Amino acid sequence: QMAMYFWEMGSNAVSSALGACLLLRVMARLEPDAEEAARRKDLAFKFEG
Amino acid sequence: KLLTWESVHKENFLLARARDKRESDSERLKRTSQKVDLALKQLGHIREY
Amino acid sequence: IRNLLDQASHSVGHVLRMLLGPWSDLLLWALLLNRAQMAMYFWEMGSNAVSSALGACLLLRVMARLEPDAEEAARRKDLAFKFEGMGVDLFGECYRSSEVRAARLLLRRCPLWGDATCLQLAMQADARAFFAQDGVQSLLTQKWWGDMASTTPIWALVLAFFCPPLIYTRLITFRRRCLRRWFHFWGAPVTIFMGNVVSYLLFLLLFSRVLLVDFQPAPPGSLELLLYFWAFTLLCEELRQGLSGSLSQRLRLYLADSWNQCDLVALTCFLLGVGCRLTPGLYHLGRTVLCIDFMVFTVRLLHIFTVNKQLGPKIVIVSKMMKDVFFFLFFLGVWLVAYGVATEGLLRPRDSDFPSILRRVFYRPYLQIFGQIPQEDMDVALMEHSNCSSEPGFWAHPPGAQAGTCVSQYANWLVVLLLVIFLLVANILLVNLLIAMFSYTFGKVQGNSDLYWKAQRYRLIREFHSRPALAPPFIVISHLRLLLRQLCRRPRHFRVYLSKEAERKLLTWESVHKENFLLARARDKRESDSERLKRTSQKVDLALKQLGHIREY
Amino acid sequence: VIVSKMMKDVFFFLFFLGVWLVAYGVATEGLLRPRDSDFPSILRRVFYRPYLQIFGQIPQEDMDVALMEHSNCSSEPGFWAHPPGAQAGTCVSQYANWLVVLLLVIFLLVANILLVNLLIAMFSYTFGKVQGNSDLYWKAQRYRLIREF
Amino acid sequence: MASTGGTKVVAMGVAPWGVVRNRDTLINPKGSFPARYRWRGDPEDGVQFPLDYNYSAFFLVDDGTHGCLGGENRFRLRLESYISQQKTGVGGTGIDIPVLLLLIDGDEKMLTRIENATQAQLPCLLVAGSGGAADCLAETLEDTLAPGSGGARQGEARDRIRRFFPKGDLEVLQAQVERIMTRKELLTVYSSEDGSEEFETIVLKALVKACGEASAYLDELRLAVAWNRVDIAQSELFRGDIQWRSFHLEASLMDALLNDRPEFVRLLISHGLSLGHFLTPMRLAQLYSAAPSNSL
C-alpha cells in the first residue's frame, strides 16, 4: 500500500510504474516460497495496469 | 516540461478514480452508514431530556 | 435415519455398526439428521476440519443414495456441496501458507471416518472439485514422481530409465545409501508406469512379430511361446489387480468399469485365439481372432495413457463424442440405405449375389465419402456399350470386378444425379455437420471432463503404487513373492505417519487457518452491500424508535 | 504464433491415430497374409498404406479379394487371390476378407470421421482460448522484433 | 459476542497460585498439557476462588502456601515496569510502550498498591464516581492549590478519607496519599459521565501528562501511529491547539514507515514534511534496517 502512494507523489510516473513492474517480477523469481512471490507478483500487476 | 505535463495527467487521473471510488454505491453505503450512525449519536445525547 | 437405526437396532454401513443410541459427535449427529445449518457450525468448532469437510461430503452423498425420495436426497446432496466447496476453500488457505504441511494434511491418518486418508476420503466421496484445485494436483504430481522431485523433466526420466547408471548422477534430484537411491527411483509411480508402457509396446511389438511372421501352422516355436508366457502375466496382473483393487462381491464391481471389460475381452479373445491356433482344424480361424485380439490390446494402450497429464484429459473426451458419432452413424445409415438401394435398383447388375448386392448398397456408397467414387462403375457414359444382357433394354457393361457384369442404362442420368445428391448429403451436409456437433460438445464436456479427469488422475496415481516395480515380462518374480507371502503366513498407499506431538501441531496450525478463514468471510458477509442495507435499515428504524419517544414533547 | 499453440492438439491426433494405425494396420496385415513380407514392406503396409487411406488413397484392389484375380500363387493350404499392387505382397490370403473390408470401414470411421473431425473441435476450441492470449503475447514480441531490425 | 467480527481481545489474568482451588496440577513433565480445568464443581466459595476461562493467559504466581492475595502484587509492578521499558515498533525502535493502571475502587491495600506504581512511574487512571480507593483519591486530585482553600484542606482530608474508610489507622492512610500526591501528574482522573467513547483520548490524555520532559518524548501523535488508530491522529493534528513543530512530525513519520501503516503516511505528507531534511541517509539506512529477518 505504501509503494502505491510513493508512486503517486514522485515524478517519472510512467517509467517508475514499469520500473516497479520490472523489479517485482524480478523479486518474485528470487523468492523461495510461493506465497511471498505471488503476493509480490500481484503487486507487479497493480503497477503495470 | 515532459515531466510536469505527465505529472499533471497523474494528478488528474488520481483525482479521477478517487471520485469514482467515492461515488461508488459501495462507498455511498459506506458513508451513509457512517452518517446514520453518527446521526444516532446525536440522538443518543437527546434521550436524557 | 430413524428406520436406518431401527434396521441396525435388531440386527458407511460400519457407521451403523458404530453409532448406537464432542464436536465430532455433534457434527455426525447433525449430518445424519440433516440439520443443515447446525452441521455447518459443528464443523466450524471441531478439529480435523479439512477431513471432516470431506468426511461430511462422504456421508451426505452416501445418505442421498439411501433416501427413497428425490426431495430429501437433493436437499441432502446440496449440503454435500457446501461441505465440499468449503473443504476446497479451507484447503486453499492451508495450501497457500505451507505447501509442505498442507501436503501433510492429505496424507495424515484421521482416526475418524474409519481411519481414511484425506485423499481416500475425497475419492470415496466422488468430490471432483476437491481434486480440481491446484494444491491437490501439485500434491498428486509429487506422489506420481514419488521421491523424484516432481518438477523433473520428461525426457531425462526416459534417459534415466534406459541408463540406471544415469540415476546416480546430478540429474533426477530426490528428496544402504546406494541401495536407498535405487528403490526410490524404480518404486516411484512414474518409473512403474513407464516400465508398464515400455514393456507393453514390446508386447505389441512381440505380438506383431508373432502375428505377421512367426505364425506357421506347425506346433509353436520360441517367440510364440514367449508371447504365451507374456500374456499369462497380463492375465495375472489384471486378475490379481481386480481381486485386490468378500470374494465374489469384488467380482461384480470388477465387471463394471468398462476398460476392465476390454481387458477381459482382449484376454478372452486371446485364449480363443490360442485355443484355435493349437488345434489343427481351426488354425485359420485362430489367426482371424488373434488379429482382432491385437486391436483390443492396442486400444488397451489408449487406456494406459489416460494417466498422462497432457494426453489423459483428451482421451477421456473421445468417449464423450460417441453420442455425436452415433448420430452421424444413424443419419448416414439412413442415407446409405436410401442412396445405395436406389442406385442398385436403377442400374441393374446381372451379378446379384447377396455378398455383392450388399456390397454395392452399403460398401460402395460408404467409400464415396472418402474420395473413392467409382464413376466408371455407376455412369454408363464412361462405360463401353454391349448387349451383355438378354432382357429387353440397353445395358453397357461396366469395367469393375464387383460392379456387376452388366448394369442397365435406362435412367443413368439420375444415377449421376443421385450421386450428386449423395455427395451433398454425405460429404457436405453430414461430415460438416458432425464437426459442428464435435465443436459444440468439445465446448461443453471439456470443462466437465477436465474436472472429471482430475479425480481419475488421482485414482490412477494411487493404483500404480500397489503395482510392483518389475515389468510384466519379469513380473513372475513379483507374483511369486505374493504367492510366497500367502504361504509363509500359514505356519505362523501413500500414508505419511504423523507423530503424536506433530499431530496437534498439524491440527492447531490448520485450525488457525479455519478461524482465520471463518473470520474472513464473515467480514465479507458483513461488508456486503446487501448487509449494509440490512444494517442501515436496522439503524434508521432504530433511530425512528428514538424519534417515536420524543413526539410526546 | 498461433500454430505453435496448436501442437498439443496435433500430438493428440498423432497419438490417437498412431494407436489406431497400429491396431488397424497390423490386424489387416495379419488377416491377409502377403508372401512378400520384407520388413521395409511389412512396415509399409501397417503404417504407410493405412495412413494414406486418411487422405483418399484407399487401395481397394490391394485389400479386397473380390476385386482381385484368384490364383494358386501360394503353396500353403488356403485360398489366396494375388493382388495387383507392386507393394501389396505377391499373394495375400482371402480367408476372412469380409472382415478386412469391414475393418477398412471401421478405420475410415475412426480416422476420417472420428479423428479428423474431432481435431477440428480441438483446433476450434484452442483457437478460441489461446488467441486472446497470443495476440496479447504477439504485441510484446512485435515490439522486440521491431527494436531488433 | 457483541461485535461478531472482533479481533479476540487478549487479557492476561495475573493471579496467585495459592488461590486457584481446582488446580489439576498441570503435567510436571515440561508443562505441555492441554489439560482442561474443572469449572463448576465446587460447593465452596470462600478464599478458594477459581480461574476464569475468558483470559488468554494466567500468570500464576507461587509465593508460598495457599492463602492471601499479596504475593502477586510485587510481581506485577516488577512486570509492568519491565513492559514500560520495552520499546514498540518493528525493530525495537519507536516509543517506550504505554502502561497504565486503571483504578476502579479498592481498599486500604489498593492505595498502597498504586503508590508503588508512581514509584515506578506508572500513569494511574482512576475513575470518578467509583468508590473506596478511587473516589478517596478523586476528591484529592481535584483538591489542588487553585480549587482548594489553601492550607484549610490539610485538615479537611482527615474527614474525607474516613468517608470511604470505616477501618482504622487513618494516619498513614492520610500520610501515604501525599506521597502519591508528590507525583500528582503520573495520575489523572477519568471524569464521570465525560468519557466512555472519549476514553481512548482520555487514556491518550494521561500519557502526555506523564511524558510531560524526560521520558523519550511521546509527542502524542507518534503514539497514535503506534496504536494504529487513524481517527485519533487526524483530530490530534487537525485540532487541539495546532502547534506541531518539525521534530514532532519527523519521528512520527518514522514509526509510520517502520511499522507499515500507510494511511498515517498520507496524513503527514498532507500536512507536509521536509523530505529534504527528512530523507537524511541515516534514516534511509534506518528504514532498511527494519526489513524482516527471514525475507528475500
Ligand SMILES: CC(C)CCC[C@@H](C)[C@H]1CC[C@H]2[C@@H]3CC=C4C[C@@H](OC(=O)CCC(=O)O)CC[C@]4(C)[C@H]3CC[C@]12C
Ligand atoms: C531397445 C529396447 C530395450 C527399447 C524398445 C524401443 C521402444 C519400445 C521404446 C524406446 C523409446 C520409448 C518411449 C520414450 C519416451 C516415453 C515417455 C513416457 O512418459 C511417462 O511415462 C511419464 C509421463 C507421465 O505419464 O506423466 C511414456 C513412455 C515413452 C513414450 C516410451 C515408450 C516406449 C519406447 C518407444
Ligand SMILES: CC(C)CCC[C@@H](C)[C@H]1CC[C@H]2[C@@H]3CC=C4C[C@@H](OC(=O)CCC(=O)O)CC[C@]4(C)[C@H]3CC[C@]12C
Ligand atoms: C458399422 C461399422 C461402421 C462399425 C461401427 C462400430 C463403431 C461404433 C465402433 C467400432 C470400433 C470403435 C472405436 C475403437 C477405439 C475407441 C477408443 C475410446 O477411447 C476412450 O475414450 C477411452 C476413455 C474411456 O472410455 O473412459 C473411444 C471410442 C473408440 C474410438 C471407438 C469409437 C467407435 C467405434 C468405431
Ligand SMILES: CC(C)CCC[C@@H](C)[C@H]1CC[C@H]2[C@@H]3CC=C4C[C@@H](OC(=O)CCC(=O)O)CC[C@]4(C)[C@H]3CC[C@]12C
Ligand atoms: C457407416 C454406417 C453408415 C453403417 C454402414 C456399415 C457398412 C458400411 C459395413 C458394416 C458391415 C459390412 C459388410 C460385412 C460383411 C461383407 C460380405 C463380403 O462378401 C463376402 O464375404 C464374399 C466376397 C464377395 O463376393 O463380396 C463383402 C462386403 C461385406 C458386405 C461388408 C461391406 C460393408 C459393410 C456393410
Ligand SMILES: CC(C)CCC[C@@H](C)[C@H]1CC[C@H]2[C@@H]3CC=C4C[C@@H](OC(=O)CCC(=O)O)CC[C@]4(C)[C@H]3CC[C@]12C
Ligand atoms: C511421423 C511423421 C508423421 C512426422 C511427424 C513430425 C511432425 C511432429 C513435425 C515434422 C515437421 C513439423 C512442422 C514443420 C514446420 C512448423 C512451423 C511452426 O511455425 C510456428 O508456429 C512459429 C512460431 C513459433 O515457434 O514461435 C509450427 C509447427 C510446424 C508447422 C511443424 C508442425 C509438426 C511437424 C509436422
Ligand SMILES: CC(C)CCC[C@@H](C)[C@H]1CC[C@H]2[C@@H]3CC=C4C[C@@H](OC(=O)CCC(=O)O)CC[C@]4(C)[C@H]3CC[C@]12C
Ligand atoms: C502419422 C502418425 C500416425 C505416425 C505415422 C508415421 C508413418 C506414417 C511414417 C513415419 C516413418 C515412415 C517410414 C520411414 C522408412 C520407410 C522404408 C521404405 O522402404 C525402403 O526404404 C525400401 C523400399 C521398399 O521396398 O519399400 C518404405 C517406407 C517407410 C517404411 C516409411 C513409411 C511411412 C512411415 C512409417
